[PDB]
Design an enzyme around this catalytic site. Structure first.
Site, short mmCIF file in Angstrom:
data_model
loop_
_atom_site.label_atom_id
_atom_site.label_comp_id
_atom_site.label_asym_id
_atom_site.label_seq_id
_atom_site.Cartn_x
_atom_site.Cartn_y
_atom_site.Cartn_z
N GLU A 35 -10.66 4.67 7.39
CA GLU A 35 -9.65 4.47 6.37
C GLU A 35 -10.26 3.88 5.09
OE1 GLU A 35 -6.82 5.67 6.21
OE2 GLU A 35 -6.14 6.02 8.26
N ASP A 52 -1.98 3.83 -0.71
CA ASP A 52 -2.48 3.21 0.54
C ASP A 52 -3.38 2.02 0.15
OD1 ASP A 52 -1.34 5.34 1.90
OD2 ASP A 52 -3.22 6.41 2.05
N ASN A 59 0.47 2.11 3.70
CA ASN A 59 1.15 2.88 2.64
C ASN A 59 2.41 2.23 2.09
OD1 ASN A 59 3.28 5.31 2.11
ND2 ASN A 59 1.24 5.75 1.29
#
Ligand SMILES: [Cl-]
Ligand SMILES: [Cl-]
Ligand SMILES: [Cl-]
Ligand SMILES: [Cl-]
Ligand SMILES: [Cl-]
Ligand SMILES: [Cl-]
Ligand SMILES: [Cl-]
Ligand SMILES: [Cl-]
Ligand SMILES: [Cl-]
Ligand code: NA
EC number: 3.2.1.17
Length: 129
Positions: A35, A52, A59
């Site tokens: 991520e 995000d 988010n």
């Protein structure tokens, strides 16, 4: 802050993420790797105008308030900026709510695509935990 792999594993454990909702620590470290590359200041703008935030790329459409995502919710009750801190407390607390929401870690598309089913224990291999 850019965490090292074992440093992040240790911080996640302190904050009770290990085995949370049945997901072992390597799942969380793996999701954070793909991520954010372990960067707490990571941000990514989505096509829909949401953003995000942080080490687990949480988010704004559902989970935090950034003032610039029309019609969104703030289910973690935090400003999205809180998710960019060096201290990962807000990100962990919010991740626990996300992973409890029904679909487990599938909420993180990078986890589904890059971590799910793989040898996630590699992510904590060798760490003094
Ligand atoms: Cl693991
Ligand atoms: Cl946004
Ligand atoms: Cl995050
Ligand atoms: Cl606002
Ligand atoms: Cl908003
Ligand atoms: Cl706010
Ligand atoms: Cl921390
Ligand atoms: Cl699950
Ligand atoms: Cl990958
Ligand atoms: Na929001």
């Amino acid at each position: 802050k850019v965490f090292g792999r074992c440093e992040l594993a240790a911080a996640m454990k302190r904050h009770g993420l290990d085995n949370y909702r049945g997901y072992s620590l390597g799942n969380w470290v793996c999701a954070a790797k793909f991520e954010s590359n372990f960067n707490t200041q990571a941000t990514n703008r989505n096509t829909d105008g949401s953003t995000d935030y942080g080490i687990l790329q949480i988010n704004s459409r559902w989970w935090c308030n950034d003032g610039r995502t029309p019609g969104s919710r703030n289910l973690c009750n935090i400003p999205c900026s809180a998710l960019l801190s060096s201290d990962i407390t807000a990100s962990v607390n919010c991740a626990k709510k996300i992973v409890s929401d029904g679909n487990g870690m599938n909420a993180w598309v990078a986890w589904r695509n890059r971590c799910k089913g793989t040898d996630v224990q590699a992510w904590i291999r060798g760490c003094r935990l």
